[PDB]
Design a protein around this ligand. Structure first.
Ligand SMILES: [Mg+2]
Ligand SMILES: [Mg+2]
Ligand SMILES: [Mg+2]
Ligand SMILES: [Mg+2]
Ligand SMILES: [Mg+2]
Ligand SMILES: [Mg+2]
Ligand SMILES: [Mg+2]
Ligand SMILES: [Mg+2]
Ligand SMILES: [Mg+2]
Ligand SMILES: [Mg+2]
Ligand SMILES: [Mg+2]
Ligand SMILES: [Mg+2]
Ligand SMILES: [Mg+2]
Ligand SMILES: [Mg+2]
Ligand SMILES: [Mg+2]
Ligand SMILES: [Mg+2]
Ligand SMILES: [Mg+2]
Ligand SMILES: [Mg+2]
Ligand SMILES: [Mg+2]
Ligand SMILES: [Mg+2]
Ligand SMILES: [Mg+2]
Ligand SMILES: [Mg+2]
Ligand SMILES: [Mg+2]
Ligand SMILES: [Mg+2]
Ligand SMILES: [Mg+2]
Ligand SMILES: [Mg+2]
Ligand SMILES: [Mg+2]
Ligand SMILES: [Mg+2]
Ligand SMILES: [Mg+2]
Ligand SMILES: [Mg+2]
Ligand SMILES: [Mg+2]
Ligand SMILES: [Mg+2]
Ligand SMILES: [Mg+2]
Ligand SMILES: [Mg+2]
Ligand SMILES: [Mg+2]
Ligand SMILES: [Mg+2]
Ligand SMILES: [Mg+2]
Ligand SMILES: [Mg+2]
Ligand SMILES: [Mg+2]
Ligand SMILES: [Mg+2]
Ligand SMILES: [Mg+2]
Ligand SMILES: [Mg+2]
Ligand SMILES: [Mg+2]
Ligand SMILES: [Mg+2]
Ligand SMILES: [Mg+2]
Ligand SMILES: [Mg+2]
Ligand SMILES: [Mg+2]
Ligand SMILES: [Mg+2]
Lengths: 80, 205, 81, 85
RNA sequence: AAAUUGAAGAGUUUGAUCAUGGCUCAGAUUGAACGCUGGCGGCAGGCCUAACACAUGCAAGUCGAACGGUAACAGGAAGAAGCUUGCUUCUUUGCUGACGAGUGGCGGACGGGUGAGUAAUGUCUGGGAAACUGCCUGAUGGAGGGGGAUAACUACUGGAAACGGUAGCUAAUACCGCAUAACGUCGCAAGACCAAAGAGGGGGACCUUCGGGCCUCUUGCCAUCGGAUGUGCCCAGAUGGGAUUAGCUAGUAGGUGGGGUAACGGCUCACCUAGGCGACGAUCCCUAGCUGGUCUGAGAGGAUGACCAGCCACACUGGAACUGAGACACGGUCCAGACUCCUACGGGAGGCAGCAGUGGGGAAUAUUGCACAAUGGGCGCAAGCCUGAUGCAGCCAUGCCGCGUGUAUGAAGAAGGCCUUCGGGUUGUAAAGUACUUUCAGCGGGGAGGAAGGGAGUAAAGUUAAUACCUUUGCUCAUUGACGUUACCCGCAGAAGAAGCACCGGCUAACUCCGUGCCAGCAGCCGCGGUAAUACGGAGGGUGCAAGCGUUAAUCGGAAUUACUGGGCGUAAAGCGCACGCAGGCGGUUUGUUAAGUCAGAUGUGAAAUCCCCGGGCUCAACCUGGGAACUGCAUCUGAUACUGGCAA
């Protein structure tokens, strides 16, 4: 019962870290239409157990660096 | 403020009697009610919807002595209160202290009642009131003070009130110079010559 | 020091105090934490001039909130009933 | 300075500045001794300097010139660097 | 139970009509300004421009219950007193009450003001961990024994001053060791280490070196674990315009290892990877403090953020750091620069975007007023001191609300004015006259409330050996208000001291006459005026408001005229010249499952103030206030599975 977010992975070139393209379904305040405003983050990737195009679940932890504030807990649907 | 000019002029402009005089004599015996004031009188004015709404509002304003700034607030209060806006405005206007005094018969004219209230000859529930726009509540008692209970004008007012029609929602004891506001007056208990629907449409323009 | 005091409001010459718990650093009529009861010194009869929350005031006095002289006088008066 | 309290605190913050600077330099001298003995390769001189430095740092932290969180960091880092020899 | 109840259009394109479409107006508001006029009172408001420059007076001081000391003052034990035999001298004397100056503790980072800068290091909403925290409070313990010197002070001396320098003495809760070391720090552990300060009141003798020892009470000090409050940091979303800003970034993204901050972190350093942000708008330019809220609008919406409250930035300009629990500090300290000031020419001082106030700018915004008497804040055990915070007073019709400037009668329809067909009508019950009332303003007198506390005592309880000192509980006594000549109430006489502004062709309610002649002129649009102008100027009359009335500037509405609710593209403006196609938008039908969007409930929060509903109190109202609803939102949990979407068949 810990607040977590699930999203794709876009880049793995950085050492021991990845990025997550969190996607959501937000309703427009004015026109009342549902859109997809994505959100990018920097997630710690100890042991580099991830890959590009993979679905991951993350967790909010202490800031590891200037842009790092999230860490992963597992990996699911390791599509190639 | 208050209007200090002629009153039969306003009555002629409105085209009907507004009860601004004592009523000892008739209106025709004192003025030409059928002829509008000014050089261009003796011809019936031909007015539009805005004109007739303005005349309907001005008739009530001149009858009750209220001004535009104090009448718009009454209209706002009537609209704010639930129910018929037009009936609530009339009820609030009838709830004025000077109007209540005039209806009871302690004053021959509403202007005289206002003057008495200003000069502090009237108390409500034993407490004097110095405001001519005091809102009377049900089960209230309005009595004349001892200092001014021996007024020839204050007794001729009752002598004319007994000739005039009596209010159902009020009670009065002429011997004690006292009256009771029983209930809030209804639409049926008032005159039928006032079309209150012409004021709401005018103020919502 | 977190304290319980009286913040003044109302029109001129007719004040109305509210017993509130706030830090001594903050202003009188500015920032506070909780509002506990009011006080009308010019209130007439058959009209409550004090509606303090004794349970809530004790909850702060047990944590360290001090009490002003006027607040203590009002507490004594309300306890005298 | 238009206030007597400000005029007095002006020299109160100077005498205290001199005392705090002297104590800080005295502590940093032992800190530098430990850091210079660490990389020399010895494991006895560095340990002796650590025992010479620790009470001074603890006393300064108690007096309030520095913080116990900083004193603990200094001691832990020096001990970790010494234990690798 | 209630918490809402909410929608108007008109004029003008044209010989005439319809349609589309542009312009203007009736409406509601302002921190508003100008013209005319001007009775009062109550609650509110008052440099939006030059974050331009400031003369002058105040705005942060307090503690003798921290310690040396008495420069002033009064109360003196004693004695030198002129002697009057008690005293109107006066050395000396800190012993006493108190205290200039100084050391020291605390406060100065709160309170107050401004919005230049910041379009994100800021603000709001909702989540957190990796942190600190004086004064406040709970608990566990300790509180031992020493020292060297500095002020103030004395002598000398530099300098015009500001400001210092040298030689010497002394005090503490100032400073430093030092003694111990725990549930504190370090480390796997063993083990190492870090703290204090005392002060005041009263008493029985065991003691006294006659100062005090000794006992009790209060207060104060140090370590740790806590609590509350406050502060620092991080993430997600939201928070202006411009693409005629399409490429930016090398400490830049990350990693390893040191250093550093109270704390995580390129915060910083050495090395290694070439990454990171960006069409969902990176970067750059312009403007702009943000929010709760305010105006308009029925409503979604549009504009805006003055006064009340919360957050952020700043204190002449650009940077810096110390003390300090907490500033990189409005009235604290260095240095550089401009602007003033003193000068003996070597040299020094100052920062009103604090409260009043000055000059200048502008259309424009106030009194160098009283008081700490209340609520707060700082200091102090307390009394008590300070407080331009605050409570109040002064000016301004700037806005809101209330009252009045008299009521009744009063036709000979007075006189006069205006119009006229010359009969008359209008001003007109209007005035005068007649009886009455006196609110407000003025005079006199009375008179609440904002005042709870504090002090002096007394009795009891606690307290201890103790009826001592101290705390609490009651009771008694003389008191503590700037406002204030208070609110408020009662008599005096007398209608006396109190009404103006705009408009009258249509929009829009209200017409006649006289002077003029496309001249003078009005104007928001249509437009009027070229000898009978209801449109110019004046008079009479009338209409709308009212101590306000008009004009001007800004916002919204009408404008469905940026249309999500709520519009169009054949001919008024609007379909790319036509195709392919990435991202993207949408998507046939059945089952099963997940339950993200969506739907229901619950919890936390969504500050207070403001809107609204039900009431209450200032003689009503404005105004204040009690409770509730609401704050359409966000986060989490419990579920439902009809639809979209994720997965499989
Ligand atoms: Mg008025
Ligand atoms: Mg200086
Ligand atoms: Mg035409
Ligand atoms: Mg049109
Ligand atoms: Mg000055
Ligand atoms: Mg002194
Ligand atoms: Mg502001
Ligand atoms: Mg000490
Ligand atoms: Mg020790
Ligand atoms: Mg000691
Ligand atoms: Mg580098
Ligand atoms: Mg490290
Ligand atoms: Mg590091
Ligand atoms: Mg700005
Ligand atoms: Mg609309
Ligand atoms: Mg805005
Ligand atoms: Mg300036
Ligand atoms: Mg500066
Ligand atoms: Mg420091
Ligand atoms: Mg700052
Ligand atoms: Mg300061
Ligand atoms: Mg500064
Ligand atoms: Mg200043
Ligand atoms: Mg000023
Ligand atoms: Mg001026
Ligand atoms: Mg000027
Ligand atoms: Mg005070
Ligand atoms: Mg002073
Ligand atoms: Mg005549
Ligand atoms: Mg009077
Ligand atoms: Mg009193
Ligand atoms: Mg008309
Ligand atoms: Mg005109
Ligand atoms: Mg003519
Ligand atoms: Mg004219
Ligand atoms: Mg005229
Ligand atoms: Mg619109
Ligand atoms: Mg259209
Ligand atoms: Mg064409
Ligand atoms: Mg076309
Ligand atoms: Mg085509
Ligand atoms: Mg489908
Ligand atoms: Mg769901
Ligand atoms: Mg829900
Ligand atoms: Mg009431
Ligand atoms: Mg709220
Ligand atoms: Mg499906
Ligand atoms: Mg799809």
């Amino acid at each position: 019962k810990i607040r977590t977010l699930q999203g794709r992975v876009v880049s793995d070139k950085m050492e021991k870290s990845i990025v997550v393209a969190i996607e959501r379904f937000v309703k427009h305040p004015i026109y009342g239409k549902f859109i997809k405003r994505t959100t990018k983050l920097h997630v710690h990737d100890e042991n580099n157990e991830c890959g590009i195009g993979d679905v991951v679940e993350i967790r909010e932890c202490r800031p590891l660096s200037k842009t790092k504030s999230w860490t992963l807990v597992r990996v699911v649907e390791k599509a190639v | 403020a208050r209007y200090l000019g002629p009153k039969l002029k306003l009555s002629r402009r409105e085209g009907t009697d507004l009860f601004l005089k004592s009523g000892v004599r008739a209106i025709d015996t004192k003025c030409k009610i059928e002829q509008a004031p000014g050089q261009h009188g003796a011809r019936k004015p031909r007015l539009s919807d805005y004109g007739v709404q303005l005349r309907e509002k001005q008739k009530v304003r001149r009858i009750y002595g209220v001004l535009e700034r104090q009448f718009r607030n009454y209209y706002k209060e009537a609209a704010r209160l639930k129910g018929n806006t037009g009936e609530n405005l009339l009820a609030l206007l009838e709830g004025r202290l000077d109007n209540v005094v005039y209806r009871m018969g302690f004053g021959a004219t509403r202007a005289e009642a206002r003057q008495l209230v200003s000069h502090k000859a009237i108390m409500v529930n034993g407490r004097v009131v110095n405001i001519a726009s005091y809102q009377v509540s049900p089960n209230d008692v309005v009595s004349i003070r001892e200092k001014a209970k021996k007024q020839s004008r204050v007794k001729a007012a009752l002598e004319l009130a007994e000739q005039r029609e009596k209010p159902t929602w009020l009670e009065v004891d002429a011997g004690k110079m006292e009256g009771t506001f029983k209930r809030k007056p209804e639409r049926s208990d008032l005159s039928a010559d006032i079309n209150e629907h012409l004021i709401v449409e005018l103020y919502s323009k | 020091m977190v304290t319980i005091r009286l913040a003044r409001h109302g029109a001129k010459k007719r004040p109305f105090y509210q017993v509130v718990v706030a830090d001594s650093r903050n202003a009188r009529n500015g920032r506070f934490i909780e509002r506990v009861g009011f006080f009308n010194p010019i209130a007439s009869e058959k009209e409550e001039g004090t509606r303090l929350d004794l349970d809530r005031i004790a909850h702060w006095v047990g944590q360290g909130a001090t009490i002003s002289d006027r607040v203590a006088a009002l507490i004594k008066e309300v306890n005298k009933a | 300075a238009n206030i007597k309290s400000a005029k007095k605190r002006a020299i109160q913050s100077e005498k205290a500045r001199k005392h705090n600077a002297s104590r800080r330099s005295m502590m940093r001298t032992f800190i530098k001794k430990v850091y210079a003995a660490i990389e020399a390769g010895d494991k006895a001189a560095a340990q002796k300097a650590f025992n010479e430095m620790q009470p001074i740092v603890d006393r300064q932290a108690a007096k309030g010139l520095i913080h116990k969180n900083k004193a603990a960091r200094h001691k832990a880092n020096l001990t970790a660097q010494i234990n690798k020899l």
